[PDB]
Amino acid sequence: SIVVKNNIHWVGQRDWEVRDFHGTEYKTLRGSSYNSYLIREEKNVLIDTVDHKFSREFVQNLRNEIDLADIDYIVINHAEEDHAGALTELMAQIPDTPIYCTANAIDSINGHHHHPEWNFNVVKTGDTLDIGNGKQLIFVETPMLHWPDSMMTYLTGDAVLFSNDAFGQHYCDEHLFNDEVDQTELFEQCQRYYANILTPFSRLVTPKITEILGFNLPVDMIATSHGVVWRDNPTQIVELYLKWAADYQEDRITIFYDTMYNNTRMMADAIAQGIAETDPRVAVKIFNVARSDKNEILTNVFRSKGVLVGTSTMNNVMMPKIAGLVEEMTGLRFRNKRASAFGSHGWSGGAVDRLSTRLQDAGFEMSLSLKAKWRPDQDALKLCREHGREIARQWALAPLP
Amino acid sequence: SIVVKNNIHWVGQRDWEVRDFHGTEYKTLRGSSYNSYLIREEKNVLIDTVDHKFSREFVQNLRNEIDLADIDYIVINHAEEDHAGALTELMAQIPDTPIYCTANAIDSINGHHHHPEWNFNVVKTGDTLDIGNGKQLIFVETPMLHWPDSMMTYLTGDAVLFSNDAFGQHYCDEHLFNDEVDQTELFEQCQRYYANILTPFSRLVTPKITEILGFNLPVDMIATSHGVVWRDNPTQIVELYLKWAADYQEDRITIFYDTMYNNTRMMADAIAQGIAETDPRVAVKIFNVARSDKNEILTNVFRSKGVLVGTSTMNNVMMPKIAGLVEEMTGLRFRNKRASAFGSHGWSGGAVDRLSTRLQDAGFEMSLSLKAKWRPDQDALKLCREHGREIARQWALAPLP
Amino acid sequence: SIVVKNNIHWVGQRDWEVRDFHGTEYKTLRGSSYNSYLIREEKNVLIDTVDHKFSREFVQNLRNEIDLADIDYIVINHAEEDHAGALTELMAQIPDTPIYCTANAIDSINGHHHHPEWNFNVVKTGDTLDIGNGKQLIFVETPMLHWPDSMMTYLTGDAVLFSNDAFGQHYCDEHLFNDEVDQTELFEQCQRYYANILTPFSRLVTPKITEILGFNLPVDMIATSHGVVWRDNPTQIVELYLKWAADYQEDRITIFYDTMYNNTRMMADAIAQGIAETDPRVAVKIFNVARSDKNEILTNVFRSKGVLVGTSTMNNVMMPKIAGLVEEMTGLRFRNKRASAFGSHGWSGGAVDRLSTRLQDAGFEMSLSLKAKWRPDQDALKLCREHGREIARQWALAPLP
Amino acid sequence: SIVVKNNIHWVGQRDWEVRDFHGTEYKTLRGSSYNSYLIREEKNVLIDTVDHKFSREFVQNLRNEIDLADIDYIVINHAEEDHAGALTELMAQIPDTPIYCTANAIDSINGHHHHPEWNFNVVKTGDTLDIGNGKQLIFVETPMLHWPDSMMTYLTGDAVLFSNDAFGQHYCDEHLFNDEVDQTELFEQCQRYYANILTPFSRLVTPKITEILGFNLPVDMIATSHGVVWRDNPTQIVELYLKWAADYQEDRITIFYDTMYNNTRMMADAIAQGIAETDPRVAVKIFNVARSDKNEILTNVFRSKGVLVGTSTMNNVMMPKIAGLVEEMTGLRFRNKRASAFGSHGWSGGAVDRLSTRLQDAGFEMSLSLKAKWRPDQDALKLCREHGREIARQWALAPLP
């Protein structure tokens, strides 16, 4: 365990190996951690547990820190298995210990663990739990940030906000605090996390942050459930969330596609040339969905004012990976972004139109599509280049030079 | 080169390494070959070339076999790059040599190679090309089997049907003939090929095979563009195609899903138990789409009377890989198959309904869906098991015992 | 559960999803199963458990079959985590239940579970455990088949041999019995299993099978810990093992390599052509280690009379995947096989000699190496074909048509 | 094309899709680019070409820039296929055009292209080629930076150093210049490139840079063959190379391993905790070789003062991915680094000693090994932490807070 501050001890679990989250839908290329905290005042409080894969290690490590029977209260901010996975093994040892969680968390905890006989204490925003020595816990309901059961727990005096998923990131390091790690890696993982997980809930991010700030509670540290503890200028991640939540976009265009014989790839490259030579303010990234990190594509879409999506026609429909990526974008609910579909076809085409409709379904404001037959010759590539010019002009954030 | 028979020489290219066809949408786990043939009678005829990646080797090997200027005619059955990819390099050496192909092949050859000045000779079904010594080529148009430009070429006397893609398979072996290879591996690759490529065109398979047989041409060998030359009971692959084309199905049910915390996986296993214990005639295969070979899933769907598809709800939509796989199935146009959607959800669900609608869009006759909240307990698993029983009873090919 | 025979019930766990065994060193492409058996005579005996990943499922399912308190004896044939992984969870409920295992299994069970207070009973070959109704278990020690702790348990009367890993295979199917599954798929997984796991212990297979046969005990079924139960002609797998154990080899040559610019790949193909045109009886397989299933390469090596391994020189050493695969072959201890190293270099070479030396270290009888500079031109490729010709003549099993 | 400076035009090819270099031994996670330059003075000079995969594109684009007949001289700094791969296609159009290259480049060009009839001009350091308008090319031989054939070309007046691989990096972007791209991304690819490619030639980097600097030639730009053109403070990359070449190391320890049941992984984590609590100045990274980017592991090794490598014993040898990675490190010749081997075993062990020996063979100064049997219990993990503590004290760069 690690001292977070005073009587707050980190009793979580680092995960250098992990690479597949959400099945295989979130690649954790820098590992992750599962942060669990033990507060030792007059009362002893455990905040969250760890992923089920480390349940045995978690309960044994916890014994190294405290006699389990000495734990007074357990707080579950969030019952996803990566944080409450060890709960069944823990409760087998101390089954009478009360659990403090949201009403919705009873449904989610019971849904996974099947132990309704546990002693649940429903908490609502503003409820308090005294732990002695003049300190108390204050609970803050954060439904759909990102689960119905989500909440945060604030510890007065020490002024630590146990935010669970919010403001966390999948980043593994032997050091605990944000000022102790590589900042580039840290920000990259922070943005990757928000873009791929929290984008659809952005409309709830700002009001809740506003509400929390309206409590006028000081914040010395933000102890999340993944990654570093924010202790140095800790609200920096809060301000990022405020910016990221406001339908964030940079002067940036992401192009991604799938291709069978590189024809659609040739179009993507000509589009990018037309953009770069018409508006030099636009950052352009190109990804082949079959040969790229999907979560990186989505982070870039999150950062872009618009996207172009490419597919060849295969059996009158679109390339399956493109269909899958468009389905996922439909659930992420990107806002205020523009899109254009393109691709090569052999005869009757149709996939590009299909894709354009579904990009519209996903919430993109659609510009005209670009289609080419077989391999584009020099004349076809000029048309693709002019498409990039036209898109660059249409999507300019300000007058072009 | 290898003697196929008499004056027919194999001048193709084996590809032990290749694994990605159609981008990454067809995994060639046993490699492939690109079959090209050189007939040396009074005239010298080249049938097809090879994939563009071996163009240099192809033209050099060809020089080892014949003075290029001695090639009289070139036949292009099919202008996909894996067979006509070497054409530009060849025509750079002998640009006056005539090319015999379908009208549509002019569009597809020009579309890839950009050399309209080449000397094209459009052929239609029944056209002949004399090559001396009493032998002649007979051309057979096979549009949309599998491309608009597809055709076959028959060589009289030798009675060899140069079928190009039709009846081929992605299978690499140093030996040339079907009787010289492992039969299990051969059939597996044959069926994998038809299921993943030719299923949507099955309605065209039977009439064309009927038409060809109506020509009363004897067949000693079928020399395809991929894999073995059929010489021993060569029409065995034709009969398979007749069976595979007739909305083929065995008493078989395929279950595939994606899952984030194994809840949908637990449902899939309980469904399978209910099936196996209610109808012992049904073969059952289960695949996690994120951890399985996609082309194998589709071969099994091709072999099944019905499928169950599982997804958890992620941001109100389905798992992206499931959306992608359903998009692909929509283009393969499976016929006379039944389907049922299932999956686990945290609160409001919706993905299962979404998936069921899209499976209906893909052409499956839908049975009721199965939904469970969080991790199924013993009562929920019984419901999943009974779902398997009900499906097994509904989908029974005959009365159950 | 499933009735195996009389009062023997299968209470194991099927694993349709598993792909990675031995870390990632054994790919289970058709899943696997962890077979556990509950015998219900006068005494109730549990034979092995399941993989740790399903311990919670295993205990609950076992509860559905019997009150855990009514379990009299627990038999652990083998303490690897895929069979004893659920033991800690089970013993937490019935900590007084005796465990019967080899002396080495006490060290392996405690090594994983850390519960030496458990009630262990050491058994030696010939020891018996009466379970009533005239039936008894007879234990047979099989150390290093494949672990020091390994043993088999025989049930008189029912004449069922619980063999644990021996005679098993990684193959998942809803049906339990060998006569109910696809035979080629079954055989493929059986041979893949022996080749990649039991090859180095082949010298122990024959004597142990002879010893067991010497007991003159009837065998109606062989109940393994992975895959089907052998009930129809169960000796068939025992005969395969006798064949596979006698330094097995077919008239077959496996060629595998790694390459950076395909120069070594060109050599591999030319070698294969020289083999195929010199001895047509030889089956040849070629694999690029960087793009192939490693366990399939090793299965072919197991089936082969000799191998050719190729590597280019990279920084004066061999390519790492070749080094790694040669390391693994050194541990498998293939016997009575021949080998020849080859590859391309830019200047100093040396990696081929390095490889040839390590192939000798791994147990192969070495033929001359084959080297080429940069890309082999037509003259160099002839040398490669001639090398193939010379290898076929050297390694001919019969005098050469 | 893009204007680099004055009459220097970039006529290369961006590669957004590429992921596999050196076969698959170098993953280009941000793509790459193949930089070719066309200088248009009185004489027209082409500097290098592009990867063979884009030779057709390269020649056609080059046609769009200039009539190929007007190309006077072709300079080949380096004949690796990613730069000279389009040479055969280009020389088929202008076969009389002289090629300027090192003597070793004649052997490497002919080695790949097989056209010795081409008009080669051997150049040595200090040789000049006048191109008119008072400007001339000056050649600098850089053998084994990184190939025997490698050289650099300097253009007086414009003061542009065409460095080919040296100072380059695999990084694709629509913008050409270093001051126009993301800096952290740029740096990351630069260091990844040096660590995985140029480390073994570090002893040649400093003397060659000193020699070039001794020429007192102004350098306004460094035009490499991969990635950006260095125009803003171009010496910055030259200084990095001087630092990276001096047996570079930070206060950093890299731990990587492979594991079958996570026992060795548990040791790695405990070791890291012992390090972090003994010397907090040390950066620690931990990687599972079977689930990590190998090139990232090697970049960290390059940055590290020492490594710990872990393996379990499998069939008396080490796990193959560890053997392969140790083979690769032997060729990279890391200098002034320390190492310690560790891992878990079931009985006889031996793989740890084997690994320790080979880590010495690879150039690491070896500390004591660390071994554990089966899964480390609390007592064994303490030994692991203490091993970490002892390693940190041994390897401390400063006396230890």
Ligand SMILES: Cc1cc2nc3c(=O)[nH]c(=O)nc-3n(C[C@H](O)[C@H](O)[C@H](O)COP(=O)(O)O)c2cc1C
């Ligand atoms: C398996 C397959 C199916 C195809 N189906 C269609 C189709 O349904 N409609 C169409 O217009 N073209 C179809 N084509 C042609 C491709 O769209 C055409 O080759 C296109 O130029 C490829 O683009 P790409 O290189 O970007 O993948 C198909 C091609 C293949 C290989």
Ligand SMILES: Cc1cc2nc3c(=O)[nH]c(=O)nc-3n(C[C@H](O)[C@H](O)[C@H](O)COP(=O)(O)O)c2cc1C
């Ligand atoms: C990132 C994420 C998003 C989710 N979105 C929804 C949702 O939109 N609606 C819902 O009912 N459940 C949602 N859930 C809950 C899952 O559907 C629930 O955990 C389910 O039991 C998981 O099924 P599985 O283990 O088969 O993947 C979400 C879960 C995660 C991790």
Ligand SMILES: Cc1cc2nc3c(=O)[nH]c(=O)nc-3n(C[C@H](O)[C@H](O)[C@H](O)COP(=O)(O)O)c2cc1C
């Ligand atoms: C990164 C790298 C390192 C190399 N190191 C050596 C070497 O140490 N000695 C040598 O003779 N050739 C070396 N070469 C040259 C290769 O061995 C040569 O290009 C060979 O023809 C490639 O064979 P392949 O295409 O089968 O991979 C090296 C090439 C590369 C790309």
Ligand SMILES: Cc1cc2nc3c(=O)[nH]c(=O)nc-3n(C[C@H](O)[C@H](O)[C@H](O)COP(=O)(O)O)c2cc1C
């Ligand atoms: C296939 C296999 C082969 C093994 N061979 C040996 C061996 O030769 N010597 C030994 O001491 N242990 C051997 N073991 C035991 C492992 O070394 C032991 O289980 C170790 O604790 C696993 O470490 P890990 O979890 O880090 O992979 C073997 C285990 C397996 C699964």
